[PDB]
Design an enzyme around this catalytic site. Structure first.
Site, PDB file in Angstrom:
ATOM      1  CG  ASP A   1      -2.085   1.063   1.068  1.00  0.00           C
ATOM      2  OD1 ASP A   1      -2.269   1.674   0.001  1.00  0.00           O
ATOM      3  OD2 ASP A   1      -2.694   1.333   2.128  1.00  0.00           O
TER       4      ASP A   1
ATOM      5  NE  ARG B   1      -3.473   5.582   1.419  1.00  0.00           N
ATOM      6  CZ  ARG B   1      -3.408   5.480   0.096  1.00  0.00           C
ATOM      7  NH1 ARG B   1      -3.381   6.572  -0.636  1.00  0.00           N
ATOM      8  NH2 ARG B   1      -3.365   4.308  -0.506  1.00  0.00           N
ATOM      9  CG  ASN B   2       0.276   3.993   4.057  1.00  0.00           C
ATOM     10  OD1 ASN B   2      -0.278   4.330   5.110  1.00  0.00           O
ATOM     11  ND2 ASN B   2      -0.301   3.227   3.158  1.00  0.00           N
TER      12      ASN B   2
ATOM     13  CG  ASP C   1       1.399   2.030   8.906  1.00  0.00           C
ATOM     14  OD1 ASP C   1       2.107   1.827   9.904  1.00  0.00           O
ATOM     15  OD2 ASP C   1       0.374   2.720   8.930  1.00  0.00           O
TER      16      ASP C   1
END
Ligand SMILES: O=c1[nH]nc(-c2nc3ccccc3[nH]2)[nH]1
Length: 270
Positions: free
Chosen positions: A133, A137-138, A151
């Protein structure tokens, strides 16, 4: 100590100092471990995570150590809710950081963010570990402005089917290659595709990819062979690198080692 495996942190050793935000799994806080050591503390909302599977994987994640990867320090397991204890990153998530126009970034800073991420991803690739992913945002930003990847692999433990189904309302359509959207084929090359989208996010100062389209429209656009186009801040050479991540044929996309070489070449040239 007694009662704790190497992956387990004693929650009694935590001091909570500040609420940072709320994410996928609930609240995240800043604190100290044994009075001294800065940590982030994620409080995992009941029902959000496949906890036993995550805890087994935490043992693997503990051993993934690279300066550009947000470190997992351990898990507080005896309890409801469980906590995930990670390296503290004072400047928060990369997407929000890009969107703050006060920073007045130079393009050399943007390329350095791409290199930070690419170094982390080359390490993960060397360990045959997929992020699954990757997106702005990660990624997180520390107090020195260094970007690190966070993450990694966690989507495998998310129980909300809206996130995990390719047709789900929360699936990362805009970061996915055609073979993921069409047939759920994840590989090193789906991480490569996502990395190209992340470079686009960086050079776009945090715009949403395909911002005028829905998820359904995006899937159609990309499955038909069309792509994002060049952010105004990207040079021709930078655009060539991100675009190379989007070959329709997965096997024609570069590795992270090649991307890193390419980024370093552009750093030297520009
Ligand atoms: O795993 C981690 N480490 N550090 C954070 C973190 N730092 C933040 C700062 C501001 C807002 C949200 C944040 N999350 N998460």
């Amino acid at each position: 100590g007694l009662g704790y495996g190497s992956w387990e942190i004693d929650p009694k050793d935590l001091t909570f100092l500040k609420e940072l935000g709320t994410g996928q799994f609930g609240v995240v806080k800043y604190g100290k471990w044994r009075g001294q050591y800065d940590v982030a503390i994620k409080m995992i909302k009941e029902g959000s995570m496949s906890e036993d599977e995550f805890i087994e994987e935490a043992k693997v994640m503990m051993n993934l150590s690279h300066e550009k990867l947000v470190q997992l320090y351990g898990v507080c397991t005896k309890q409801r809710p469980i906590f995930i204890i990670t390296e503290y990153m004072a400047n928060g998530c990369l997407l929000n950081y890009l969107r703050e126009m006060r920073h007045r970034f130079q393009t050399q800073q943007l390329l350095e963010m791409c290199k930070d991420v690419c170094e982390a991803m080359e390490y993960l690739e060397s360990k045959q570990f997929l992020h699954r992913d990757l997106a702005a945002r990660n990624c997180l930003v520390n107090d020195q402005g260094v970007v690190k990847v966070s993450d990694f692999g966690l989507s495998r433990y998310v129980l909300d089917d809206e996130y995990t189904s390719s047709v789900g309302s929360k699936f990362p359509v805009r970061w996915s290659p055609p073979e993921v959207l069409m047939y759920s084929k994840f590989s090193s090359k789906s991480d490569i595709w996502a990395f190209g989208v992340l470079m686009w996010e960086i050079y776009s100062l945090g715009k949403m990819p395909y911002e005028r389209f829905t998820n359904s429209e995006t899937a159609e656009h990309i499955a038909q062979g069309l792509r994002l186009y060049r952010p105004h801040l990207a040079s021709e050479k930078v655009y060539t690198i991100m675009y190379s991540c989007w070959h329709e044929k997965a096997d024609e996309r570069p590795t992270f080692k090649i991307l890193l070489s390419n980024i370093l070449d552009v750093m030297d040239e520009e």
